[PDB]
Design a protein around this ligand. Structure first.
Ligand code: GTP
Ligand code: GTP
Ligand code: GDP
Ligand code: GDP
Ligand code: MG
Ligand code: MG
Lengths: 432, 430, 430, 432
């Protein structure tokens, strides 16, 4: 009945998607193909055919064709519908203009059609899940191009996006500040709720809590795979207090332009050191509010919380959830904004998280995913805007962007909009 | 005769209702397949109050299950006592309400309410004598708060004289489970105070205390809480279904419990409640049952009666008892706590005694109390609502669905007036 | 009728109380499971004095067990006759008092006293006719000295007319078991002299002598001492529970034993006490029982009556006896020891005779003596208290919990006044 | 229900802890792991997990990582929680300044967090047990740093510490007087009761009473292990007259700045010569007051007793305890201060002490541990202050301390404070 269309943009989204759909197939008994061996709630993500083959309800789009070409040769070659996997001629080359104005224009009409063929095949449309990179290229331009196209064809339908936000210190591209601001300016008015994660933050978690000194990108994706499973577990499984994707918009977004929650997942524990842990509900709930466990390298205590969604899983008792949240509300260090006395949205599900073979997480009994909107993220935007200001003041790389469909003015408009958003975060955080 | 039709709403109502119909079916000998296998014939005499009959001894509850999402009922029909319900009564949409009152009431439920009414009228018209409508929902959600109040207005406009009683789960003060609770509660209450006869306010936090303190339950699921709510809902409708030394009809309670039209918010209770290990240390007699009924720790609402005064009270007993004991205890409570009872009402207790107790219990009692202390609940919600509303905390989600800021101000004013009225009648004569 | 409610406190009270309820249950035929299997029906007629009834013949003691630490009661409930008590009556905190009166009375017990009262009122209100409250504690500890006196003040303020009798273990003169005893004793006594009707002062050192000298016991545990205390506590409340030729109610003793309001400190005793090998060399008759009752070596308090004078005396006999013998012996004692009895009281003996003796004994007797020699005990504590207080020996542990040095001075002044009053009434007329 | 958090600092504390937790595991049937074979009062020291694994409620902290690294390779490798064992980069090098100002600052925030995760997991917090060395390094600086941090986060909670006080003649470090005074000055106002032991004193006992000419550090620790078991036996086991850790503070500490009891353990007897001993209660009680059995090389008869705690164990009759203490009170040689007529706190427990296999103590039936506060310890402080005065007068080793975060003035302030404390001990010992 319910449905979720997954759009995976760029190398990040495609590689994150590989982990998501390896988990979903495992959460439903699927056999790396559309086949199920000789397992009934899959309908939210998997379309079914008379052959016994289940087809993921996802669209893989990339202007580059090396990452997707690896899927077609991978173990999941025979899972996805071949026309879902869309590849272009030449990548965006870390340039927002190429992704949005020159190359995106030649693929957007193709991905949008395949989305249409999926939207009309659903008994009822619930929302879109967008996976993309914030660094730039396809993830910055194509997404903002696609987001604007979905906003008109589908209007009020929910649009949730998972963004790999740039890390404070770590960086892999030189023009991230240009791409980060340009995409944000064109996605504020077309996105409902953007869940942020940082590679650096997960890198800390992967060695600080999981005992691994060599995290690859596969490890980070498998951690992100768990989060999305938890977010969509209510649709996929039964529970005591369920939550729907359209509930996040109102619960987490007090104002239309402030829709950037952080992310967390408490029981990120090594298998060996799990033998010495009780892993009770009150303790994991407290771990969510520690700076040491955030998946975005932004310290919550530098700001004030504005909304929180606690999505429990597995063996959980709602009485314990009530107690743990009550104590957390008591702590003075954990500060909520005054104008939000009602601070928590709670969701409980009966399905324990499943562990991917060859993975790193322990076989936990119960888990909680926390989605918190905080004013602390205002610091990250200010830091990002400073980097953009340094480069733009010198016109460090402008000639690349201006010469591929964009214009000089858009740099000024994008930055001032980010200034307004940073101002807005300040007004929200002050009272009387 | 005196049939009751049950309406669900949201996930809360559907979960509570599924347990209520398991309890009711238990005391009437109704199997999960619909067949009757009870021993006493008395439980079958008045089985028409909730059930409709069919060929082969099948009995069909007069229940209407509605939600804007089918995930909840699909659990209901898949679980025990789910095949009992008539399939045509599952009225549902595809896109749920995002915990916002505006969507459930104006946009999403508006287009689906007509489908529900067409089932309600069909159910009601099959009743020889319709007593009233019974609605279970939650004020903090979107479907229950929005659609449940939309149904209430529609039915009240279509059955003006019938009694409508609501068993609504109220947001707890300690911790919330929905960030927009003040908006849903305030808007939902704005409708209840005008379009229902008797609302039974309960909150989960209070039921958590009862399980933790009294029952000494260490793993209280929502099934345990819903059983507590079921027992009180069964209690207030036992005179309609069983004989007793002194009967109390739903309208009998409303007359005795509602002095003024708008003061119709009750906080229920139940007794006996004892742990598995403390059962062998109790007499299980009328004097103690009446003692814990008025105990503030045994009430299913957060507000403590000690902070206010009882306008009225009802004590629906069950099981064979000495009428002398019952009257003496109620009088004994009246004398000791004379400060807790409003003085311009000479007698503040309405009594009833049903002859048949719940299965496995020799005695039982259901407490219903209309107390001015309930003003705390609404005043607390007013403080939260005005806090968020002062700086447009989440309005755009509501005004975008068709609402308007004027309605927000009207709802708050009405709730404040009700709090004022409850406070006003807490003062003695002159 | 004339029900007694038992209150515990600290480790001393809980250990003494657990033995008292084993003895009481023995003479009433109550099994450790709560069932009754006695032979004589008389022991069941007045069983309501201490026990409440339940379904299936289960009898539940009207006991309230309280301590600031649960280690002691967990031993109580785990041991024999521990499952008898009602689980709801175990009222306890987590952090114990460090043997300081300030913590138990002002800081630790203050926040827990309300929980106890809610159980005391519930227990008391179930009594057809409440006779009084019975408290067992120790003046040298922190919970018993501090919280026990806090309860005493609370109950006396809530039940002004009822009789409150305390069986308090007093610090011994020879050796101490707590370095801060003078502070706990002085502060606790400051409360007792104002808020209790009859205090039964006992000390372990005296019971050690009795076991060593009379019983010739070579391995006296605390169980043996507590049995001695239990027997005297059973003795003073036998007329309420059994018939006799001449009855003595608790208020009957208090009237006859307390001339002035503040002189209500008694030193109990018991008889017969004989070793296992010396039993075949005794007549076991009234003349000898009365002889060892007044023997200073057979009293459960350190102070020797020879150093002062008896203001009054009570002799609660048990077993079938010749009333002529009893009166002649009491008169015989009065004549010989005329120097030991105050002269402005023409008769210094109150007599009673219960018909039923303790199990395994044909005869028994309980001695209660209000003697001016008790002034030695308080004067000795005053000397220790003023020694420590002269140079702030341990005050910081007390003043840090909320106390103040002024309260220390007031407590000492009050104790000195009581010692003065006891001395003043030791002199003859004019 | 009850709880005790054990913090072990430095090489001394860690190695003393190894003996303590080998005894506790033996006192509870534990099997060198968290497992108990196919045993119910452990809850005071051991946390429990659903796996059947019991986790010690202790924190091992050291700036050096050789001693703790040996635990991780020892027989108890799989007992402790791996994050309890905290190790640093470089040791304090017998320097108080390094432990307190430079290296401690980089670990204190880590150990304090693990303490927090334990404090909130207890049904009710009773107090802290601190094991550390007085010689110096981590034990002198880190502890005083940790003690000040616990004093604020937990306020009035009981803080008991077991210190290896420097011996009069024997010494293993050249700068002990600097570390001993500096740590004492910063621990007087943050510690409740410090139990003192000397290596030399136990060395005498180990050969004079136990017939061993070759005591290692393992032997001394096993003797200290018994003492702590006796102190905490009341919490762990049932008895006739129990005592709680919060009772020591008021019973032994007449004044806030005078909280340094000695220690004793009477039945320290060889197995072979135990066959010729009755080991009755009166005799062992008298042994506690003999200078030949003190665990601190300070003679009690050089001063006046001020408080005594007799913690009996095993087959003991309270009547005998009453008699023995009565006779001891009679002896004139055993002098108590006049202003303390009430001299004894008594505790009786039903659990006989357990003998560690491969140990040296005999299988005694009953045992008594005595904790006495005496003015005689004033001599030890005076001796220690003299050694400090000699070195400081020449500034013998000051340059090491000043150059690692400390300052010249702190030497003067620390010493004058010790002078005041020595003066205070004199005032307490005089009457009228
Ligand atoms: N978590 C995670 N992040 C990734 C992964 N691959 C790339 N990224 C992030 O993506 C950011 C840059 O955007 P890309 O996805 O590499 O570029 P693109 O979306 O393919 O757009 P083009 O530049 O046109 O190729 C980098 O800063 C990475 O942090 C991945 O496998 N896992
Ligand atoms: N009883 C006992 N004492 C010990 C033991 N190990 C060390 N000590 C004492 O510790 C004193 C010196 O402090 P240490 O513990 O060695 O030094 P530290 O605490 O590790 O601090 P650092 O100097 O930074 O290493 C010595 O004088 C020893 O008497 C032990 O195993 N048992
Ligand atoms: N007792 C009980 N309360 C519930 C249950 N489900 C939801 N609630 C309460 O309902 C509120 C959430 O609103 P909800 O009914 O789920 O939204 P709706 O589906 O749109 O009506 C919260 O305050 C919950 O405590 C249930 O099964 N049992
Ligand atoms: N007869 C007897 N006396 C006890 C017992 N336990 C403690 N005491 C006495 O009580 C005093 C100690 O105070 P205590 O009651 O333990 O402290 P509390 O728990 O705070 O009340 C000492 O004088 C002991 O002699 C017991 O079981 N039997
Ligand atoms: Mg690319
Ligand atoms: Mg070291």
């Amino acid at each position: 009945m319910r449905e979720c269309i997954s759009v995976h943009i760029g190398q990040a989204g495609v590689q994150m998607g590989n982990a998501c759909w390896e988990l979903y197939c495992l959460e439903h008994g699927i056999q790396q193909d559309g086949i199920i061996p000789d397992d009934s709630s899959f309908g939210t993500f998997f379309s079914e055919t008379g052959s016994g083959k289940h087809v993921p309800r996802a669209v893989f789009v990339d202007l580059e064709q090396t990452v997707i070409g690896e899927i077609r040769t991978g173990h999941y070659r025979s899972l996805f519908h071949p026309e879902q996997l869309i590849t272009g001629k030449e990548d965006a080359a870390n340039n927002y203009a190429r992704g949005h104005y020159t190359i995106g224009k030649e693929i957007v009409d193709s991905v949008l059609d395949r989305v249409r063929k999926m939207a009309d095949q659903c008994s009822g449309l619930q929302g879109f899940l967008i996976f993309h990179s914030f660094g730039g290229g396809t993830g910055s331009g194509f997404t903002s191009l696609l987001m604007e196209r979905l906003s008109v064809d589908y209007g009020k339908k929910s649009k949730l996006e998972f963004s790999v936000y740039p890390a404070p210190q770590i960086s892999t591209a030189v023009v991230e500040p240009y791409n980060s601001i340009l995409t944000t300016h064109t996605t504020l008015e077309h996105s409902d709720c953007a869940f942020m994660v940082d590679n650096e933050a997960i890198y800390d978690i992967c060695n600080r809590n999981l005992d691994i000194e060599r995290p690859t990108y596969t490890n980070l994706n498998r951690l992100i795979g768990q989060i999305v499973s938890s977010i969509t577990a209510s649709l996929r499984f039964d529970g005591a207090l369920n939550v729907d994707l359209t509930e996040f918009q109102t619960n987490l977004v007090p104002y239309p332009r402030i829709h950037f929650p952080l992310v967390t997942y408490s029981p990120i524990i090594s298998a060996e050191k799990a033998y010495h842990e009780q892993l009770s509900v009150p303790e994991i709930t407290n771990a969510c509010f520690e700076y040491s466990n955030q998946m975005v390298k932004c310290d919550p205590r530098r700001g004030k919380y504005m909304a929180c969604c606690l999505l429990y899983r597995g063996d959980v008792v709602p009485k314990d959830v009530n107690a743990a949240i009550a104590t957390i509300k008591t702590r003075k260090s954990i500060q909520f904004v005054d104008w939000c006395p009602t601070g928590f949205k709670v969701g409980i599900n009966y399905q324990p998280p499943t562990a991917v073979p060859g993975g790193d997480l322990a076989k936990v009994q119960r888990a909680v995913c926390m989605l918190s909107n905080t004013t602390a993220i205002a610091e990250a935007w200010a830091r990002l805007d400073h980097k953009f200001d340094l480069m733009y003041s010198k016109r460090a790389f402008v000639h690349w962007y201006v010469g591929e469909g964009m214009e000089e003015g858009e740099f000024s408009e994008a930055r001032e909009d980010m200034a307004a958003l940073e101002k807005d975060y300040e007004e929200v955080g002050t009272e009387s | 005769m005196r049939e009751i039709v049950h309406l669900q709403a949201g996930q809360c109502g559907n979960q509570i209702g599924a347990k209520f119909w398991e309890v009711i079916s238990d005391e009437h000998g109704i199997d999960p397949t619909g067949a009757y296998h009870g021993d006493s014939d008395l439980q079958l005499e008045r089985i028409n109050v909730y059930y409709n009959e069919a060929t082969g001894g099948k009995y069909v509850p007069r229940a209407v299950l509605v939600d804007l999402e089918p995930g909840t009922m699909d659990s209901v029909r898949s679980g025990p006592f789910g095949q009992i319900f008539r399939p045509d009564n599952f009225v549902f949409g595809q896109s749920g309400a995002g915990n916002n009152w505006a969507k459930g009431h104006y946009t999403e439920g508006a287009e689906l309410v007509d489908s529900v009414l067409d089932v309600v009228r069909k159910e009601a018209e099959s009743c020889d004598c319709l007593q009233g409508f019974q609605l279970t929902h939650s004020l903090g959600g979107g479907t229950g708060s929005g659609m449940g109040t939309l149904l209430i207005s529609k039915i009240r406009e279509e059955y003006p004289d019938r009694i409508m009683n609501t068993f609504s789960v109220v947001p707890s003060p300690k911790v919330s489970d929905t960030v927009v609770e003040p908006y849903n509660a305030t808007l939902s209450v704005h409708q209840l105070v005008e379009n229902t006869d008797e609302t039974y306010c309960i909150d989960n936090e209070a039921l958590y205390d009862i399980c933790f303190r009294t029952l000494k339950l260490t793993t209280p699921t929502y099934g345990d809480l819903n059983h507590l709510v079921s027992a009180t809902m069964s209690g207030v409708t036992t005179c309609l279904r069983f004989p007793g030394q002194l009967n109390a009809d739903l309208r009998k309670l409303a007359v005795n419990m509602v002095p003024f039209p708008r003061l119709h918010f009750f906080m229920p209770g139940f007794a006996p409640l004892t742990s598995r290990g403390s059962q062998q240390y109790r007499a299980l007699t009328v004097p103690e049952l009446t003692q814990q009924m008025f105990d503030a720790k045994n009430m299913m609402a957060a507000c403590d009666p000690r902070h206010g005064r009882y306008l009225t009270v009802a004590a629906i007993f069950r099981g064979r008892m000495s009428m002398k004991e019952v009257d003496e205890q109620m009088l004994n409570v009246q004398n000791k706590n004379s400060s807790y009872f409003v003085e311009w009402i000479p007698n503040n207790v309405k009594t009833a005694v049903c002859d048949i107790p719940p299965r496995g219990l020799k005695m039982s009692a259901t407490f219903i109390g209309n107390s001015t202390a309930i003003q705390e609940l609404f005043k607390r919600i007013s403080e939260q609502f005005t806090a968020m509303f002062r700086r447009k905390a989440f309005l755009h989600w509501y005004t975008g669905e068709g609402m308007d800021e004027m309605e927000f101000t009207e709802a708050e004013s009405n709730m404040n007036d009700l709090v004022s009225e409850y406070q006003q009648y807490q003062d003695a004569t002159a």
